[PDB]
A paper describes a structure:
We recently discovered the cattleyene synthase ([name]) from [name] and studied its cyclization mechanism through isotopic labelings. Some polycyclic diterpenoids have attracted increasing attention, e.g. gibberellins are phytohormones derived from ent‐kaurene, while phorbol esters exhibiting the tigliane skeleton are currently in phase II clinical trials for the treatment of acute myeloid leukemia. Their biosynthesis is attributed to diterpene synthases (DTSs), the type I of which catalyzes the conversion of GGPP through diphosphate abstraction and cationic cascade reactions. Substrate ionization is mediated by a Lewis acidic trinuclear Mg2+ cluster, bound itself to a highly conserved Asp‐rich motif (DDXX(X)D) and an NSE/DTE triad ((N,D)DLX(S,T)XXXE), to which the substrate's pyrophosphate docks, with assistance of a highly conserved Arg residue (pyrophosphate sensor). Here we report on the crystal structures of apo‐[name], [name] complexed with GGPP and Mg2+ ([name]‐GGPP‐Mg2+), and the CySC59A enzyme variant.
For a deeper understanding of the increased but less selective production by the [name] variant (CysC59A), its crystal structure was solved at 2.30 Å. The structure is highly similar to the apo‐[name] and [name]‐GGPP‐Mg2+ structures (RMSD of 0.16 Å and 0.15 Å for Cα atoms). The active site residues of the three structures superimpose well, with the exception of F86 located between C59 and the substrate binding pocket. In the apo‐[name] and [name]‐GGPP‐Mg2+ structures, the thiol of C59 is close to the phenyl ring of F86 (3.4 Å) and renders it towards the active site, while in CySC59A this interaction is disrupted. As a result, F86 moves a bit away from the active site and the phenyl ring rotates 24° clockwise. This slightly widens the active site cavity which may lead to an improved uptake of GGPP, albeit on the expense of selectivity because of a less tight substrate control through cation‐π interactions. Gratifyingly, the [name] variant gave a similar product profile, but with a much better production (about 6‐fold in comparison to the F86A variant except for 3). The [name] exchange widens the active site cavity, resulting in a relaxed product selectivity, with a series of unprecedented ring closures and skeletal rearrangements towards 6. However, such alignment based targetings cannot fully substitute for the structure based identification of residues, and in fact the position analogous to C59 in [name] has not been targeted in any other TS before. For this purpose, all 20 isotopomers of (13C)GGPP, prepared enzymatically from 13C‐labeled FPP, GPP or IPP precursors, were enzymatically converted with CySC59A, followed by extraction with C6D6 and analysis of the product mixture through 13C NMR.
Residue numbers in the entry: 12 to 363
The structure:
Amino acid sequence: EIPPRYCPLPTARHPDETVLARRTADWIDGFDLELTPQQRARMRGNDAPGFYGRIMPHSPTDRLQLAVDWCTVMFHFDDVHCDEGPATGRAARFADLATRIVRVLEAPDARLEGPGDTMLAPVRDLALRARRWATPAQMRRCAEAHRAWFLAVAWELGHRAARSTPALNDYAHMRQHTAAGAATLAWAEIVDGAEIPDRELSSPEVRALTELAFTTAAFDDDLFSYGKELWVARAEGTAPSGLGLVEILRRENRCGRPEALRAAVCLCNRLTHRFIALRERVLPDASAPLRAYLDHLCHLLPGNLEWGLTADRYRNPDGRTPGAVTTTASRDTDPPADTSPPAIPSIAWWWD
């Protein structure tokens, strides 16, 4: 199913996944989400502890709980508040809820609860808990990373409402944001307990590294969730969504499905190799917090792959069919023969 991914990076699991799973489930249960057992099962299928624990396998358990908890509520946000509710006024309802969430991260006692709100109390709890470990610059990074995610989701809902297919150039730099890469990883330096110097985090080389890691992970997410996209489309009697690297290359190259999967993986291999090569040049002068950051990006790439191929989120999607979708993967041990920049301008500067 998925042609050989080049990813010569070790992957490891956090030893306290079970503890994290238990507290996560308990923590999200103490608000007012009114979670059905079906909903609690899908959350288990999301394996938030397995996902973040692979990003940070050596982190202390009580601090990792912060990042894990966030994945918990943002899987629920993703599945209940993204592309759902009435089609009439759908964009307005998203943007309204998105800006509330950002504000609560900036001001936990803003009290922006509307009628029937159940996505702000846990976000507030996360903000309050994040203000006990994090520097001001850190908090600011979480808010603005949430803005980047949500602006990209507004972009995404436009395409879903039109069933359009984004051109490759546009998708190639937007996908890191619809995937919430930066918002997902911004918790890591808070868990680590040391501020990454803004001067480093803003340098062009680190920005390339950052966007390489998040784009790669999101393209992989597109790969290991392709089956689900095919299942959903088969169930709903529609064509697969254009919001996905495979379908975009299909439409762009007027090719068949297998050719598109090979092209998608070829691209992923080139991004991954570029990320590794650029990491080599950056490491020597890297402060310890930046090194740690690159360490988490390095665990993210193979960790995301292993999570996505094994998590029930993408195998038993509705929560009632064990093995409806099965997805295979290989590891290509050879680096890509072509190390030059792809013909995708919106991202070419990563090879600068």
